[PDB]
Amino acid sequence: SSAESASQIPKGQVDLLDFIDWSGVECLNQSSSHSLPNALKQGYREDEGLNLESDADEQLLIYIPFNQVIKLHSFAIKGPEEEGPKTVKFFSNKEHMCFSNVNDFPPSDTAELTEENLKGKPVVLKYVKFQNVRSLTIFIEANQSGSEVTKVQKIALYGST
């Protein structure tokens, strides 16, 4: 799908929103009372009506398959400062995995929500590992302030093909 809205693609990294498969997206939570598109598909990212949150489980597992193989270069996740996801783990090159196994397998990268990330700034991660991305699972287990509840306004991944 050709999917944009208000995405700012700089020079260095391209948005992966349009590179997402969308059809095979899978969520083992996606908010027990909310849906996934809320924070990922730009446009619905308005924390007023719909957002991606942790309903009860602060630990959230979201699986995103892509339509093309690109390299993940930078990531951008936003939410509230207290309810923002800090412990961000990713794992690519693996289609289908629940968090039980994510504990035994080393993540692709483990990021922290920086205050700048919280503003919509693409933070660069280990590009040396992201060479082939057909699949990317995002496992967020802990939030910024340990506030029990986590809220996500928007998720954006930027890659460099």
Is the torsion defined by CA of 158, 79, 89, 26 positive or negative?
Answer: negative
115 forms bridges with which residues in the sheet?
none
CB atoms within 10 A of CB 41: 19
Detail the DSSP E strand segments found in 21-131: 26-27, 52-53, 60-70, 72-78, 85-92, 109-111, 123-124
- Structure-solving method: NMR
Query: Which of helix, strand or coil describes residue 99?
Result: helix
Q: Name the fold adopted by 1-161.
A: Jelly Rolls (2.60.120)
β-pair type (14-15, 109-111): unpaired
Give the separation between CA 132 and CA 122, rounded to whole angstroms: 19
> DSSP for 133-153?
EEEEEEEEEEETT--S--EES
CA distances to 9, 36, 110, 111 from 124, rounded to whole Å, are: 14, 24, 11, 9
CA distances to 99, 100, 130, 144, 149 from 71, rounded to whole Å, are: 23, 26, 5, 27, 31
Across 11-32, b (16+ Cβ under 10 Å) vs e yields eebbbbbbbbebeebebebbbe
Query: Which of helix, strand or coil describes residue 37?
Result: helix
Give the separation between CA 37 and CA 131, rounded to whole angstroms: 26
**Where exactly are the structural domains of the chain?**
1-161
